């Protein structure tokens, strides 16, 4: 029999281990020859595994690289202009890789060039609230200063945007041991912690969903018209560079000016964490000087796109996609995900070779240039947007499979909650102490829902991964899953070795998942979701789950506004239309669910499957959110303060944010009311897609 | 048998005559009680005729009305401020209507209030090229002048926009006998010509597809947030008023300054048609003074929406819609169309009562507030956009059925050309001299295609009617048909009595269509198109016809650019990508047509019907055209110079228009190249929707 169990049983931990090893022996930086060779390898193997077609889709997009003969570094310079301390030119390579070529040195991708010299101000995590504290409470002015900020809490491009708007003339990013060194564990190679010489690479763009900076809205194909650099989307205006904590300690130790406002501003280094500006008395004539010489360059990138044609509904697409490009070896990010996708393709191909095909078409994607701004997935979606919006059932992301070894992490649309609950009840838990129990049981025990008894936590989608175009721009139901750490007992950010030269195959095999049992569990979750989406007769979406969350988010946004009762009275700000729309959605979703259960008629079925598929699509507003035309989903958008976090009712949330500081309250509360109207109308319009069609 | 012939045979000229009489005894101005009563009458009758549901959909939109106790008029004032001549306060009512109440006096809807006094400049038809001639060739400056312009050639809102940008402080519109008095025919009531006291009402907005000025993008429902008047879309900034040719002759006869530049500037009045500014020597101290006191007011409007549910594909909608509101009696516009829709609803309802249902759902619409800017249709489409874009098969408009008695006029998407040709070959011609011949035969003989032998002319859709939202914003295949005049042997504009108090039931019954045989023919064309769209197993669209026209339009836009060969060399402006995309579309459309002919499988069928339905949709760009976000179709938009005319490849056309006058040619030709890229990409993307789906 060819059923889900046959698919799941064919998946093997040992294959995922072999593929991970194969994908992480050399760097696969986007735009380099090594990453093109790996694309061609994956294309050939997916064909051998049995897919119907496998093509490369290429684009020419703006990338950024250091200059090999003019390296980036930061100095402390004395009054005579002598550089008395320089930061490192590269990370010390890990054992057995000290002769590997083409390791890109640490840099912030898309930084402009410059050699700014000035006094330092320490800005904590450079979040919106850190800058409010400096400017409004401490009266510290960053204008014309170099800011130094610790990584953590928010996407690094938001930190750079915040520093730019504060008037900074450069930004230094660093990894503090408070956020990247777990107590009691050793530094790589003897444990999974970040050494003092490790550095986190990463792009610092603020693209808001645009894709390639030069071609917003349209694929970067051979005849594309490109914006000039000065009109490009999302590029920073001040130089930026990242460093490790040995180098940060030398820049921070001399800091003077004001004390940190409180303990939340202190990391773990043996320094005062003074905010500045500048250095204490003895050193007050010393300054900090950046030297950034990286260049932006249009460069060819390659996505691999595999098709397994559907037997019954070939014009319905279920997409499993994840990136292939890495900053260095990508032992976790992305190759622990790419190895899982490769084994999933192999397992589906084994069924196909025995004569099976799924009901709907499955598309498999190996995206390029994700690390430079989600460029490969977004360009491909721009090229194929008409196919995707009329035919796209769901997108399942497949970046890193593990970021810890504690429990499952799922982030997805409410439409997939029931699918995930039911699938995880049928899968075995890999956790010690839960032998013979379901994954649902271990996950629910370790990560309880804040809202419901005997349910697990499932988070909102934010951004910072390749589902962004599919979900926030095109309104295709999307989800992701991986193994993660215990977020309670840990104060560190993500995993410590993120985007460092130390993130290797050995890291994973020695410290995260020696038996590859967590990778296998994640392959079962991602592949099982794909299987059910592509094979279930009725699409496995439950509209009633969206009704429940919409009420939660309406309660939340109303609570924010109700901190301003006098203004709500003055400007007649009512949420009644939004609660009415959510009540209607709840009633109509309940009636649709009864029909779906009570309806031999393939046209009633497809009609009803189209109602299910287009429900996520109904939350799209073609005019987009304010000043973010490519964030079109009215219920969810990446937070304006942190691309990695999702925000609910984002148009209303941003209209309310810091509203007490706005100079024209009547204008500000009028925009709150406009966003309430847009949200209530969109929820009611989405509800009406589930009414009887005529 | 219940087939198309049964439907067509049930239609009766005598019923259309009775309905026309019933709809034209009193005015039905939008927003008035009489128009609401007629909406309720139509709702009740459509229910009696047999529709499954019939509802009113209401909205509160900005309308405009004169002030009943402070009338609008224009004066000539002498140096002492005495008003020595006043224009009329109303049109002399026609025989037997001299006691009818609630006839709105002539006014330009949405004019601001004002009493500007100044010197006149005559600007011919106030087209873009008329203002170029005045400013660039004659060196006449309109700044601070009142302009007087003759109706004709272009939409009156474009004339007002052009006068505003020339610096005018007011506009007087008038009907010249050259354009509204056919030689050899008598004035109403003794013939169909415009009397000297007749005046053309009409709105002067420049909405570019937005709908209600106060709520662009969103329906004007009970909780809508409205823009303030100062931020409203499309309102004119200078006062405007229309007059008849007896009053125009008094304003024009004293004109001095420069002579008309040539004969194309002279109408038929016994005046010199001097351009001004101001009056000849003896009268040079006299001025013209407008007095406009109309007010804009949010007012409730009502669409009637009837549903005949489909038997097999109830979630596929074929829409037959036309407006109900009129300026006065609406004897032609719109009631000659509304009477045809009413008889079509009656005939479908007769089949339904005998047990028949069409394959797909048919929606019937009686739109409100069309005369004030397409407001009813656009608000309803904004409310229902998600249903329409996923389910809308086609929209057939049904405004005026007749504007002459000579031959058929059809304007539609290329997707419907084959449908129209085949249907008209099966219909009887009503024309004298073609007894026993098909409508196709008389139409082709009287209105030959410029391109093809033995084919009839079918024009592009422009705007200025209720299909605009469906076609240009949402990308739903649309078409319209009516009986029209001989455009060769006539120098007049549209029909002479347009938007005057004289456009009555008697006009139609005495002079246009005494036997109602042209109305019956138009009912057969519109109802037959609806029938075939709602009942054919395979949707009756031929993608190959789009391929043919795309080549014609690419040749045309290339020819425009090739007037500037030096700039095309300097800036490397190539149309190669656009011709490549059109070649690919032609090849892929041919292969799709073979599959459609070569494919018992209802899923292959619907898959292929969805490919046909979403083909028009594929030409939509979600980012819209430059500065016109609600014109989203890349192949067709209303002309930027004349809303009534369609323009092909509008983004490229507007980038090329008057390009030799642009101050920065590199920037201007860069925008030409960007628009070529957008057009080539959209054509290729639309082609790829017709490729095999996996
Ligand atoms: C949730 O679903 C319900 C339907 O179950 C839907 O109810 C609709 O609410 C609107 C109000 O937003 C109602 O609109 C009224 O319609 C009647 C005619 O049917 C009008 O006469 C009303 O206008 C009068 O009253 C107003 C309020 O005092 C005045 O402002 C106005 O000037 C008029 O005097 C009003 O337009 C509508 O009837 C119901 N439809 C029903 C019950 O079927 C509700 O809107 C949905 N929620 C959302 C957010 O869409
Ligand atoms: C019409 O349909 C055809 C397919 O039948 C489609 O053809 C495609 O054209 C593009 C060009 O726009 C081709 O792209 C090439 O792809 C190859 C790899 O397959 C690349 O190596 C090429 O790049 C090299 O050459 C360029 C030109 O000199 C250089 O600028 C570049 O730096 C590289 O040196 C280039 O990208 C593509 O292969 C074909 N696909 C086929 C034939 O299947 C055509 O684009 C369609 N028209 C439109 C408007 O879409
Ligand atoms: C800050 N929060 C929440 C958080 C983090 N750490 C914590 N610790 C404790 N102890 N406790 C906590 N409550 C906590 N909370 C985040 C941050 C990041 C992630 C995330 O998962 N990120 C990656 C990133 C994958 P990438 O590297 O390939 C994408 C790339 C480009 C992105 C782009 O350009 O758009 C980039 O980010 O540089 C992914 O999505 O897989 C999700 C949540
Ligand atoms: C100027 N060209 C071409 C033309 C006209 N007359 C000619 N004579 C000779 N002899 N020769 C010629 N070549 C010629 N050519 C036009 C102008 C108008 C039409 C048109 O058909 N118009 C109505 C208008 C219906 P409406 O009144 O209900 C819409 C309303 C609101 C519109 C809005 O706000 O968007 C308004 O226009 O005021 C319709 O579409 O049914 C189509 C072509
Ligand atoms: C990763 O695995 C691939 C696939 O097995 C290896 O590529 C093959 O290498 C052999 C020996 O060089 C060739 O004969 C095959 O043509 C290759 N197959 C391909 C490219 O599909 C590759 O060597 C492995 N890489 C590493 C680093 O182990
Ligand atoms: C998750 O599993 C539940 C429990 O089996 C499914 O809910 C049942 O669905 C069947 C089949 O339609 C109904 O007859 C039952 O009454 C449902 N039981 C309930 C609601 O407890 C549910 O549909 C599954 N969710 C999916 C497939 O998305
Ligand atoms: C237009 O026709 C309608 C429908 O026949 C007429 O309205 C009917 O009038 C009679 C007599 O007043 C009433 O008893 C019916 O209730 C009406 N039916 C409706 C409204 O559906 C109407 O009188 C006619 N109008 C004109 C001007 O002839
Ligand atoms: C218009 O009528 C023509 C002539 O009947 C139709 O074209 C024929 O379609 C049949 C049925 O598929 C084919 O077998 C013939 O070979 C076609 N003949 C041709 C192209 O001359 C055409 O499809 C009709 N158009 C519609 C319904 O939109
Ligand atoms: C890199 O630096 C070298 C050495 O100074 C220089 O010659 C070259 O221009 C730079 N390359 C760039 C800017 O791409
Ligand atoms: C830092 O590098 C600069 C540039 O090469 C050099 O002049 C300086 O001597 C270095 N300083 C130290 C302390 O190594
Ligand atoms: C910050 O510093 C600069 C002085 O160089 C000044 O332009 C800016 O207005 C200051 N902002 C304050 C004090 O808020
Ligand atoms: C794996 O789990 C063990 C046991 O809880 C823990 O002590 C160890 O730190 C974990 N490894 C990683 C990399 O999280
Ligand atoms: C109409 O004019 C009258 C008479 O002067 C005036 O009282 C009233 O304000 C006007 N109505 C309006 C502006 O709606
Ligand atoms: C024009 O109307 C104004 C306003 O009522 C009046 O003062 C004037 O006498 C009228 N002029 C003529 C010539 O009728
Ligand atoms: C038109 O007239 C006004 C003078 O009042 C002036 O402001 C404007 O620049 C003139 N334009 C010309 C002469 O082009
Ligand atoms: C109707 O047709 C006749 C015969 O061609 C023509 O002379 C007459 O003017 C037409 N009526 C109208 C209103 O066009
Ligand atoms: Ca792009
Ligand atoms: Ca609106
Ligand atoms: Cl992921
Ligand atoms: Cl029409
Ligand atoms: Zn990643
Ligand atoms: Zn990464
Ligand atoms: Zn009309
Ligand atoms: Zn009209």
Swiss-Prot record, chains A, B:
Subcellular compartments: Cell membrane
EC number(s) stated in the UniProt entry for this protein: 3.4.17.21
Catalyzed reactions per annotation: Release of an unsubstituted, C-terminal glutamyl residue, typically from Ac-Asp-Glu or folylpoly-gamma-glutamates
Residue sites binding substrate per the record: 156, 203, 370, 463-465, 480-482, 498-499, 643-644
Recorded domain comment: The NAALADase activity is found in the central region, the dipeptidyl peptidase IV type activity in the C-terminal.
Glycosylation site list: 22, 67, 86, 99, 141, 282, 405, 422, 584
Outcome, altering residue 586 to A: Abolishes enzyme activity
Signal peptide (residue range): none
Membrane topology (UniProt): Single-pass type II membrane protein
Pfam hit, one: PA
Residues involved in Zn(2+) 2 binding: 333, 371, 499
Outcome reported for the amino acid change (mutating residue 400 to A): Reduces enzyme activity
One term of GO molecular function: metallocarboxypeptidase activity
Documented effect of changing residue 371 to Q/D: Complete loss of activity
Known regulation of activity: The NAALADase activity is inhibited by beta-NAAG, quisqualic acid, 2-(phosphonomethyl) pentanedioic acid (PMPA) and EDTA. Activated by cobalt.
Comment on pH dependence: Stable at pH greater than 6.5.
Names of required cofactors: Zn(2+)
Cofactor note: Binds 2 Zn(2+) ions per subunit. Required for NAALADase activity.
Further information: PSMA is used as a diagnostic and prognostic indicator of prostate cancer, and as a possible marker for various neurological disorders such as schizophrenia, Alzheimer disease and Huntington disease.
PANTHER family: GLUTAMATE CARBOXYPEPTIDASE 2, N-ACETYLATED-ALPHA-LINKED ACIDIC DIPEPTIDASE
Gene from which the chain derives: FOLH1
Name of the protein in its database record: Glutamate carboxypeptidase 2
Subunit details: Homodimer.
Keyword annotations of the record: Calcium, Carboxypeptidase, Cell membrane, Cytoplasm, Dipeptidase, Glycoprotein, Hydrolase, Membrane, Metal-binding, Metalloprotease, Multifunctional enzyme, Phosphoprotein, Protease, Signal-anchor, Transmembrane, Transmembrane helix, Zinc
Region (NAALADase): 220-533
């Amino acid at each position: 029999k060819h059923n889900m169990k046959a698919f799941l049983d064919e998946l093997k931990a040992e294959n995922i281990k072999k593929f991970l090893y194969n994908f992480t022996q050399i760097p696969h930086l986007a735009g380099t020859e090594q990453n093109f060779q790996l694309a061609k390898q994956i294309q050939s193997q997916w064909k051998e595994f049995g897919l119907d077609s496998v093509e490369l889709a290429h684009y020419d997009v703006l990338l950024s690289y250091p200059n090999k003969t003019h390296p980036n570094y930061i100095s402390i310079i004395n009054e005579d202009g002598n550089e008395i301390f320089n930061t490192s030119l590269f990370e010390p390579p890990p054992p057995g890789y000290e002769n590997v070529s083409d390791i890109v040195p640490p840099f912030s991708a898309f930084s402009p060039q410059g050699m700014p010299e000035g006094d330092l101000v320490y800005v904590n995590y450079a979040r919106t609230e850190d800058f409010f504290k400096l400017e409004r409470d401490m009266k510290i002015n960053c204008s014309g200063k170099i800011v130094i900020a610790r990584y953590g809490k928010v996407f690094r491009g938001n930190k750079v945007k915040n520093a730019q708007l504060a008037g900074a003339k450069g930004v230094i990013l660093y990894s503090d041991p408070a956020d990247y060194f777990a107590p009691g564990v050793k530094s790589y190679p003897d444990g999974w912690n970040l050494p003092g010489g490790g550095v986190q690479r990463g792009n610092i763009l603020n693209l808001n969903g645009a894709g390639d900076p030069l071609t917003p809205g349209y694929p970067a194909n051979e005849y594309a018209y490109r914006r000039g650099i000065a009109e490009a989307v999302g590029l920073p205006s001040i130089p930026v560079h990242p460093i490790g904590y040995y180098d940060a300690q030398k820049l921070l130790e001399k800091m003077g000016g004001s004390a940190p406002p409180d303990s939340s501003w202190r990391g773990s280094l043996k320094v005062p964490y003074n905010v500045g500006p500048g250095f204490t008395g003895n050193f007050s004539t010393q300054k900090v000087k950046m030297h950034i010489h990286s260049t932006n360059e249009v460069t060819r990138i390659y996505n691999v796109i595999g098709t397994l044609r559907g037997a019954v509904e070939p014009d319905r697409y279920v997409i499993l996609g994840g990136h292939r490009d890495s900053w260095v070896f990508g032992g976790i990010d992305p190759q622990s995900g790419a190895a899982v996708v490769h084994e999933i393709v192999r397992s589906f191909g084994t069924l196909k070779k025995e004569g099976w095909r799924p009901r709907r078409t499955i598309l498999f994607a190996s995206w390029d240039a994700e690390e430079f701004g989600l460029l490969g997935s977004t360009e491909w979606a721009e090229e194929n947007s008409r196919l995707l919006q009329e035919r796209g059932v769901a997108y399942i992301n497949a970046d890193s499979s593990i970021e810890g070894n504690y429990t499952l992490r799922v982030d997805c649309t409410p439409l997939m909650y029931s699918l995930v609950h039911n699938l995880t009840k049928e899968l075995k838990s890999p956790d010690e102490g839960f032998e013979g129990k379901s994954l649902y049981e271990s996950w629910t025990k370790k990560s309880p829902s804040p809202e419901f008894s005997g349910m697990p936590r499932i988070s909102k989608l934010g951004s910072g991964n390749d589902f962004e175009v599919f979900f926030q721009r095109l309104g295709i139901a999307s989800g992701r899953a991986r193994y993660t750490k215990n977020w309670e007992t840990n104060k560190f950010s993500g995993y410590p070795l993120y985007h460092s030269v130390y993130e290797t195959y050995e890291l994973v095999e020695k410290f995260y998942d020696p038996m590859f049992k967590y990778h296998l569990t994640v392959a079962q979750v991602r592949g099982g979701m794909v299987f059910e989406l592509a094979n279930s007769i009725v699409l496995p979406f439950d509209c009633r789950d969206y009704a429940v969350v919409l009420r939660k988010y309406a309660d939340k946004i109303y609570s924010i506004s109700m901190k301003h009762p006098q203004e709500m009275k003055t400007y007649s700000v009512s949420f009644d239309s939004l609660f009415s729309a959510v009540k209607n959605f709840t009633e109509i979703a309940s009636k649709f669910s009864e029909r779906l259960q009570d309806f031999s008629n393939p046209i009633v079925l497809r009609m009803m499957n189209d109602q299910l598929m287009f429900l996520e699509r109904a939350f799209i507003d073609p005019l987009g959110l304010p000043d973010r035309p490519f964030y079109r989903h009215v219920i969810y958008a990446p937070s304006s303060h942190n691309k990695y976090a999702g925000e609910s009712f984002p148009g209303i949330y941003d209209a309310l944010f810091d509203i007490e500081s706005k100079v024209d309250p009547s204008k500000a509360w009028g925009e709150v009311k406009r966003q309430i109207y847009v949200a209530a109308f969109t929820v009611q319009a989405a509800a009406e897609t589930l009414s009887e069609v005529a």
